[PDB]
Amino acid sequence: MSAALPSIQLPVDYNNLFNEITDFLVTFKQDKGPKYMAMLQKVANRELNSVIIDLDDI
Amino acid sequence: LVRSLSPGDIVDVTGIFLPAPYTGFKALKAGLLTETYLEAQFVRQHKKLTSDVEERVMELITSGDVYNRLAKSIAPEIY
Amino acid sequence: PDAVFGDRVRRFQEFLDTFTSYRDSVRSIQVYNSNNAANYNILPHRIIISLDDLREFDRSFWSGILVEPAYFIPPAEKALTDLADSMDDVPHHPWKLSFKGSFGAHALSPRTLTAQHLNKLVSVEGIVTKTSLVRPKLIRSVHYAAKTGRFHYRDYTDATTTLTTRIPTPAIYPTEDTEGNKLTTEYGYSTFIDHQRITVQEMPEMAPAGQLPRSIDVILDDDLVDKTKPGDRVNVVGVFKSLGAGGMNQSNSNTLIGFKTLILGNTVYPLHAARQMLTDFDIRNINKLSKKKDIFDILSQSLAPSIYGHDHIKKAILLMLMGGVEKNLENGSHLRGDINILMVGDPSTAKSQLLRFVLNTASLAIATTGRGSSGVGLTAAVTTDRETGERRLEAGAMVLADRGVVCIDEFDKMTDVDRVAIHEVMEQQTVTIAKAGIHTTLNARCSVIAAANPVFGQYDVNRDPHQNIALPDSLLSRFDLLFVVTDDINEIRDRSISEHVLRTHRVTIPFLRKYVQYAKERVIPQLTQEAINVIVKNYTDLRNDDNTKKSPITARTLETLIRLATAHAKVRLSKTVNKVDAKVAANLLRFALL
Ligand SMILES: Nc1ncnc2c1ncn2[C@@H]1O[C@H](COP(=O)(O)OP(=O)(O)OP(=O)(O)O)[C@@H](O)[C@H]1O
Numbered sequence: 001m002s003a004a005l006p007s008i009q010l011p012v013d014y015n016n017l018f019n020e021i022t023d024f025l026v027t028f029k030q031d032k033g034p035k036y037m038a039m040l041q042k043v044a045n046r047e048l049n050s051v052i053i054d055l056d057d058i
Numbered sequence: 059l060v061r062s063l064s065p066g067d068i069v070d071v072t073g074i075f076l077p078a079p080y081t082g083f084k085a086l087k088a089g090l091l092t093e094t095y096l097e098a099q100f101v102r103q104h105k106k107l108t109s110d111v112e113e114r115v116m117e118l119i120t121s122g123d124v125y126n127r128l129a130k131s132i133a134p135e136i137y
Numbered sequence: 138p139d140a141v142f143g144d145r146v147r148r149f150q151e152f153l154d155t156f157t158s159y160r161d162s163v164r165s166i167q168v169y170n171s172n173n174a175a176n177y178n179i180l181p182h183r184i185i186i187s188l189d190d191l192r193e194f195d196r197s198f199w200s201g202i203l204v205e206p207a208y209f210i211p212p213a214e215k216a217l218t219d220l221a222d223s224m225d226d227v228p229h230h231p232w233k234l235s236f237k238g239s240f241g242a243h244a245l246s247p248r249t250l251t252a253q254h255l256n257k258l259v260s261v262e263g264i265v266t267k268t269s270l271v272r273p274k275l276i277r278s279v280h281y282a283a284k285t286g287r288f289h290y291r292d293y294t295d296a297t298t299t300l301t302t303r304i305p306t307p308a309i310y311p312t313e314d315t316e317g318n319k320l321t322t323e324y325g326y327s328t329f330i331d332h333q334r335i336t337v338q339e340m341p342e343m344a345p346a347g348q349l350p351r352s353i354d355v356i357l358d359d360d361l362v363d364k365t366k367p368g369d370r371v372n373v374v375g376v377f378k379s380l381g382a383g384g385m386n387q388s389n390s391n392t393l394i395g396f397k398t399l400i401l402g403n404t405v406y407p408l409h410a411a412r413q414m415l416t417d418f419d420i421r422n423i424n425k426l427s428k429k430k431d432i433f434d435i436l437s438q439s440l441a442p443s444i445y446g447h448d449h450i451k452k453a454i455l456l457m458l459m460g461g462v463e464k465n466l467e468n469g470s471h472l473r474g475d476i477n478i479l480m481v482g483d484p485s486t487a488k489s490q491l492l493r494f495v496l497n498t499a500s501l502a503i504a505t506t507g508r509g510s511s512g513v514g515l516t517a518a519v520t521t522d523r524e525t526g527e528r529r530l531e532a533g534a535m536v537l538a539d540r541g542v543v544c545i546d547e548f549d550k551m552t553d554v555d556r557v558a559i560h561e562v563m564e565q566q567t568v569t570i571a572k573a574g575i576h577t578t579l580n581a582r583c584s585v586i587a588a589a590n591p592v593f594g595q596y597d598v599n600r601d602p603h604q605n606i607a608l609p610d611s612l613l614s615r616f617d618l619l620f621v622v623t624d625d626i627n628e629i630r631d632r633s634i635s636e637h638v639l640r641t642h643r644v645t646i647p648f649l650r651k652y653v654q655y656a657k658e659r660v661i662p663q664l665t666q667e668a669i670n671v672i673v674k675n676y677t678d679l680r681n682d683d684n685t686k687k688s689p690i691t692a693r694t695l696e697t698l699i700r701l702a703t704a705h706a707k708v709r710l711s712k713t714v715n716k717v718d719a720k721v722a723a724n725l726l727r728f729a730l731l
Contacts, residue, residue, distance in 0.1 A: 001315050007290035079309050092273045
């Protein structure tokens with residue numbers, strides 16, 4: 001559609017972040033194995049329903 | 059995070075921001091008013107019997123001093 | 138466009154010399170704001186164009202701004218904002234105007250409306266007493282096709298561009314642009330702005346006595362919100378503007394105005410007839426006269442230039458007006474640090490004289506007249522629905538009293554229902570109310586000044602000096618000074634009076650208001666063991682002499698006896714509680730009690 005429906009080209013996209021969450025797989029080994037993946041197991045067995053995705057792990 | 063707040067809680071919430079449409083009487087009134095809210099993410103609450111407290115119950119039993127030290131304990135700010 | 142655009146471009150080469158002195162200014166204000174934001178571990182876009190740089194050498198371009206202010210201001214913005222990037226583009230918000238100056242006879246007092254200049258530049262002054270809500274508003278939201286990864290662009294126009302009556306977009310949010318992609322919106326890159334209306338009354342002294350005060354209203358923007366406390370001598374300037382369809386949007390339209398007066402303006406200023414910047418000269422002279430050891434007495438006599446004597450009263454007013462501090466207790470209730478004096482006297486003895494001229498030098502302390510409707514310290518839950526779904530606890534009379542002074546009259550000529558309100562606001566700094574809504578503890582630092590009259594004429598001497606007004610002692614115990622003005626008749630006393638009223642039908646004031654408002658910004662000593670040793674001796678002898686004589690005094694009277702001397706050192710402008718202050722504090726109470 002015409003009349004200024006397209007915008008300016010922004011350098012900030014999402015696909016550059018999309019694959020950067022794909023490298024939020026098992027790679028964070030400083031903090032018994034992948035610790036945020038360890039919390040993923042204590043939800044699937046149905047006892048607690050709140051994950052915590054902090055900024056410390058970022 | 060529900061059922062974890064109270065009236066009178068001196069607290070703080072961390073959370074994300076968004077406005078909302080009004081979808082009622084939008085032509086005559088409600089031109090482009092916004093009436094936003096904030097959406098919560100985390101609560102960091104503050105300022106909250108023979109169960110790891112018996113050590114201070116013994117402090118009254120060993121020292122004794124019921125009739126006077128406890129009398130000076132409650133409200134020592136008068137003459 | 139060539140005709141409507143040509144004198145734009147000829148101005149576009151013209152006004153660039155009219156910011157030879159501002160093209161430095163507009164970039165210096167941002168380069169540090171660009172710097173500090175990169176090293177945190179803040180100002181809006183204000184470009185004050187004076188008259189002088191646009192009247193000395195342009196005349197055709199001049200009078201267009203004061204006749205038709207609708208084809209010129211968005212020209213001036215668009216040619217402004219390129220200079221923001223042509224100066225600053227290397228590091229990786231429209232900069233609208235303010236236009237300060239004079240005007241040459243457009244001080245329309247809004248009791249008068251115009252037939253000449255509608256839709257023009259208007260200068261308006263007065264007081265505001267409405268202070269409506271705050272609410273954001275969208276101007277431009279950006280959409281994003283999450284499939285194919287492409288973005289979009291959309292701007293909403295409204296009755297906020299101030300000049301051009303564009304075709305409105307009667308829409309809140311669109312969905313499904315010409316594709317099969319579910320539209321997503323990025324709200325971080327969508328821009329907002331606020332919107333606040335305020336009604337302005339008439340300055341009720343220069344409007345002549347044939348009418349009540351009138352009012353109009355003004356829509357401002359973010360740059361000067363929360364600047365307008367209710368009770369300020371404000372002075373705004375903006376465009377005059379009508380909006381709304383009158384006569385067609387409903388049919389038959391009989392006797393319904395459809396042309397609302399609005400002001401879409403800029404740049405308010407408080408005035409004074411808080412900001413008084415003084416030079417090195419006057420700030421040094423006030424220290425030079427501070428070196429004199431008499432200036433506490435000179436200020437007493439240089440206050441009320443009409444009335445003889447009452448130097449005990451005259452020093453008290455300047456002692457009260459300047460104010461004593463309250464040091465808040467850490468994790469404890471703070472005490473009374475307010476001071477609250479009282480008067481009473483047999484009539485026509487200048488009890489109400491000096492009460493009205495404290496309001497002229499008040500330094501933003503607007504008082505009432507003591508008419509005691511419920512509203513003296515409360516809200517009474519007046520909301521007026523605030524555009525269908527907003528309830529507001531509208532501030533009655535304590536938002537003006539904060540860090541200021543008030544005065545009310547006729548205590549015994551009142552009902553009961555005000556007296557219960559003055560009980561609460563004296564024992565406690567705050568009121569808290571829940572009428573049909575919200576419990577809210579809003580704070581208040583007030584200091585009353587009283588004026589009542591005795592009941593049974595001249596019956597003070599032949600009866601008890603106490604109970605002489607017999608209003609409840611809930612207030613007398615909460616007050617300290619009960620000055621009883623005498624009116625004794627001596628042939629040299631009245632003869633001296635008779636000429637002094639006669640000589641006035643035909644050390645300065647603005648220096649005085651500077652001295653106190655400079656002395657509210659100096660440090661507070663509180664600390665000398667010498668001065669506290671003498672006053673308690675000074676208390677104990679009258680602690681033997683209060684109970685066997687006139688009036689029993691209490692422990693809170695000692696908190697006066699620090700507080701008067703504490704402010705008395707504030708007159709001295711020093712950080713050492715001396716000895717000499719403790720002698721005037723004792724001697725002032727000695728006349729107040731004997
Ligand atoms: N004690 C006084 N000394 C000098 N002038 C006085 C005195 N009392 C009154 N006057 C003159 O009288 C005029 C008005 O006095 P005023 O009306 O304030 O009395 P008041 O304080 O109002 O008493 P009340 O409140 O009982 O009416 C003033 O212009 C003042 O010059």
